[PDB]
């Protein structure tokens, strides 16, 4: 049904009302109290609601529009209009000139090369603010979601037919930055992201951006005083993944599982359903063999009059007795089976369901 | 002409009227050799290649994942089994998952599961071996005149070259380890790296035949299953302090040689002097080493003649062959003010 079969499952009981629990992702807690229904609390989602894209780092870029300008000695340095264009990365050098290549004078003449930079593949850096954290909790009764914010810490949700439950939950994001790649995400420190050796631009959502620190992926190397060649560093994707293997990984969506939530349940106004129902007088049919759920508890699958209480009793060689994990089992329809979770009887005995089937296990 | 506009230029002269001259050639540089009554030569190292190399390894820098396969079992039913677990194309991992009625199991417990991914490489690099015997130096010898290649192997070190109309030159070169280094070849560039350094690179590799088998695939695929991504940029970063060469054989560095000009013959010594006036066809200019180039044209129906020159000549025996075709003369002027006289007339003031 739910919360059954989960390995990291906690059973918490109301003290001699209120119930204190700790929810963690991938885990479920089953709480039980005197005269109160047994419910399953599970932390479904923990999200960052709205994030601002602060930077876009370029991990793979391309080069277009290569332009060159050379001058003879005694004519000064070369000049390109593109040196002022921020789409271009440029560098000056000096090359051997003379009569042989069109100069009246022999010497080293200035040369400038500019390449137009375009990013093909990029990653994003988003900002997380503590007030935009949104935990999602789901509450289910043994045969209703509520969202929790640091702004709205206490949540009152209504469980149909059982009353209303109260949830008082209590959970440095401004000093961390969420680094987003193709579909993954990591939580890293602000300064480290700021010092990443990759060209970046600020994601103003406007196309044809202006990239800064372009020299970190485009550099120049001049060979034997007769040319200048422009090189691209290549895809820094794997370098990023390697550098981020030790950072805290989340799932991207913006689902964080690096956070737990301690809550307090108020069952004062909780009412137990089916106290005015009659008992079922007909027979139950074993739908499945009973099995043990890793915690000693046993699951009994039965199929069925009216909405009724399910008669459940434990009798030894001679003499009956009354412990159920599923509180007040009720058959709502004859067509739909019901699963019953029980605390196993110690010592071989007769487990009677109805008024009836006999099962030992 | 040649060897003049180059900044990395060496002037070596046969000492006290000698016929042999020892020089050292390096790429991007040119050497000017001169001897008494011998033509001035320009020696240049055109190419330095490694002839035939064996690709020892192939490193995978970008790979892809295809055909993910899964096998799960309920508790008390044993381990999961996939046929690909023995198949060397696949990287696999075993784990345990919570199973029960919810996932189709009669019993509640941790059931075994195996996941396998098929590895395929998208873009690769090579690690090749260079052997000292496959080195081939290419040298080019030219006569320095205003108006011939030899190949050298550590096997055939000494070369006799023919200069047309000028005789024969002797070259005794000596190539100046490759056993402990490996050449890393990428998309079109290559670097010289130590053998152990290449061997300890954390990338999946194979020695191949296509449709290969890759080793150490866990260096790019681990366990949800993830790919580490293109390690191209990481490699380029790792080689910033390396020696960049070009691959196609492969083009790589220095060469110490000895030139024997004993049998080299100088042409045009029997011509007479020109007695008419010379006309400056181009402005005289100083080279990166103090020498000056003078482009002149002769005026007067003389014959092929010696150009009267007075102040040391870099260009040996300047000769006007026709009045219509100009001649370029290179001379080394003395440091400080001096008069360059061309003819017997043009007078030029240099500093």
């Amino acid at each position, epitope marked *: 049904m739910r919360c059954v079969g989960v390995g990291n499952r906690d059973f918490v009981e109301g003290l001699s009302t209120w119930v204190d629990v700790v929810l963690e*992702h*991938g885990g479920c807690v089953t709480t039980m109290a005197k005269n109160k229904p047994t419910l399953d609390i*599970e932390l*479904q*989602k923990t999200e960052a609601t709205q994030l601002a894209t602060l930077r876009k780092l370029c991990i793979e870029g391309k080069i277009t529009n290569i332009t060159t300008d050379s001058r003879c000695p005694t004519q000064g340095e070369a000049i390109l209009p593109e040196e002022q264009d921020q789409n271009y990365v440029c560098k000056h050098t000096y090359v051997d000139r003379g009569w042989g290549n069109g100069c009246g004078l022999f010497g080293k003449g200035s040369l400038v090369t500019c390449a137009k930079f375009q990013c093909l593949e990029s990653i994003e850096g988003k900002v997380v603010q503590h007030e935009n954290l949104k935990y999602t909790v*789901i509450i289910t009764v043994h045969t209703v979601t509520a969202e929790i914010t640091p702004q709205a810490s206490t949540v009152e949700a209504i469980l149909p037919e059982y009353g209303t439950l109260g949830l008082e939950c209590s959970p440095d994001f401004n000093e961390m930055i969420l680094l987003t790649m193709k579909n993954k995400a990591w939580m890293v420190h602000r300064q480290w992201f700021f010092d990443l050796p990759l060209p970046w631009t600020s994601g103003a959502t406007t196309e044809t951006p202006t990239w800064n620190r372009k020299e970190l992926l485009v550099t120049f190397k001049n060979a034997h005083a007769k040319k200048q060649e422009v090189v691209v560093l290549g895809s820094q994707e794997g370098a990023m993944h390697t550098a981020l293997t030790g950072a805290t990984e989340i799932q991207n*969506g913006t689902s964080i599982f690096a956070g737990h939530l301690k809550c307090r349940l108020k069952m004062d106004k909780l009412e137990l359903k089916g106290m005015s129902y009659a008992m079922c007088l007909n027979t139950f049919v074993l*739908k*499945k063999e009973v099995s043990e759920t890793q915690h000693g508890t046993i699951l009994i699958k039965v*199929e069925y009059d009216a909405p009724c209480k399910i008669p459940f009793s434990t009798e030894d060689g001679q003499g009956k007795a009354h412990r159920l994990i599923t509180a007040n089992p009720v058959v709502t*329809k*004859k*067509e*739909e*089976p019901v699963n019953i979770e029980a605390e196993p009887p110690f010592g071989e005995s007769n487990i009677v369901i109805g008024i009836a089937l006999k099962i030992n296990w | 002409m040649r060897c003049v506009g180059v900044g990395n230029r060496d002037f070596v002269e046969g000492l006290s009227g000698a016929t042999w001259v020892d020089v050292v050639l390096e790429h991007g540089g040119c050497v000017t050799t001169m001897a008494k009554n011998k033509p001035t030569l320009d020696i240049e190292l055109q190419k330095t290649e490694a002839t035939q190399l064996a690709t020892l390894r192939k490193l995978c820098i970008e790979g892809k994942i295809t*055909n*993910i*396969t*899964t*096998d*799960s*079992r*309920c508790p008390t*039913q044993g381990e*999961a089994i*996939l046929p690909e677990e023995q198949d060397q194309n696949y990287v696999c991992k075993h784990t345990y*998952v919570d*199973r029960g*009625w*919810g*996932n*189709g*199991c*009669g019993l509640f417990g941790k059931g075994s599961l195996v996941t396998c991914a098929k590895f395929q490489c998208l873009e690769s690099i090579e690690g090749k071996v260079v052997q000292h015997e496959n080195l081939k130096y290419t040298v080019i010898i030219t006569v320095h005149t205003g108006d011939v290649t030899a190949e050298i192997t550590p096997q055939a070190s000494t070369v006799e070259a023919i200069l047309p109309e000028y005789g024969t030159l002797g070259l005794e070169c000596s190539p100046r380890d490759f056993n402990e280094m490996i050449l890393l070849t990428m998309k079109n560039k290559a670097w010289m790296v130590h053998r152990q350094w290449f061997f300890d690179l954390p990338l999946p590799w194979t020695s191949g035949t296509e449709t290969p088998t890759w080793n150490r695939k866990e260096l790019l695929v681990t366990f949800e299953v993830v790919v580490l991504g293109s390690q191209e940029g990481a490699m380029h970063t790792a080689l910033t302090g390396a020696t960049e060469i070009q691959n196609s054989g492969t083009s790589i560095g220095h060469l110490k040689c000895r030139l024997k000009m004993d049998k080299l013959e100088l042409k045009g010594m029997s011509y007479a002097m020109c007695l008419n006036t010379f006309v400056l066809k181009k402005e005289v200019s100083e080279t990166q080493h103090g020498t000056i180039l003078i482009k002149v044209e002769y005026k007067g129906e003389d014959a092929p003649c010696k150009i009267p020159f007075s102040t040391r000549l870099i260009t040996a025996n300047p000769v006007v062959t026709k009045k219509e075709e100009p001649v370029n003369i290179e001379a080394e002027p003395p440091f400080g003010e001096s008069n360059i006289v061309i003819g017997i007339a043009l007078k030029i003031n240099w500093y």
Partner: antibody
Amino acid sequence: VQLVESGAEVKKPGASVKVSCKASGYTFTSYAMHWVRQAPGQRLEWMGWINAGNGNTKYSQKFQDRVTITRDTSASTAYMELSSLRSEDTAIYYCARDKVDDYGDYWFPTLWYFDYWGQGTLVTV
Amino acid sequence: SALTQPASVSGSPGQSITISCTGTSSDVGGFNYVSWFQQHPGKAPKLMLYDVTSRPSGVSSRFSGSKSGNTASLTISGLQAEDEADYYCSSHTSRGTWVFGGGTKLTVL
């Protein structure tokens, strides 16, 4: 809960067909969408499924190269595209739903999988 | 097909009938993901049984199921004229796939 499939199409061998499956009456992103075809007079045959919450898919080895299953969350509609069509592909194509877990993942199906089926799209090649 | 069903099944109205579904230890002998669908001519299959014994709320109790080893079976008691149709069993495999039975043509005499 209702599943609506696109109309019948007729194509020539070698072409491709793209049939749609629009969901109504339930949260589209909380259910995986499966595709099953049935040749005339033959049994049901499973082609693959898509997790509508995150786009994760998994195909049958018989259809893994020619089949592409996609989704439009804004349209709450799943798509099945079969390319390189053959005369054998003449069949009725159904879609069938199954629920995902609470974390949006689909590793193990529910026991009541394929509980709702679309009317079916006839594709003749 | 990985699951084996009888080709054709017939019975008199009001009788009880059983259609078997034999697979392997990796589909039916391994997991309880055994389902039964009914397909009337021209219509889509309708889920009749799941979790070998269980049946949807809308489905009548006349349909019951059982499983032993690698063989499951759908039993229909008190046969009616509406039940004449094709019946398909299905199973989730150990390799994360789905397999269907060959189909059984149920005819009401």
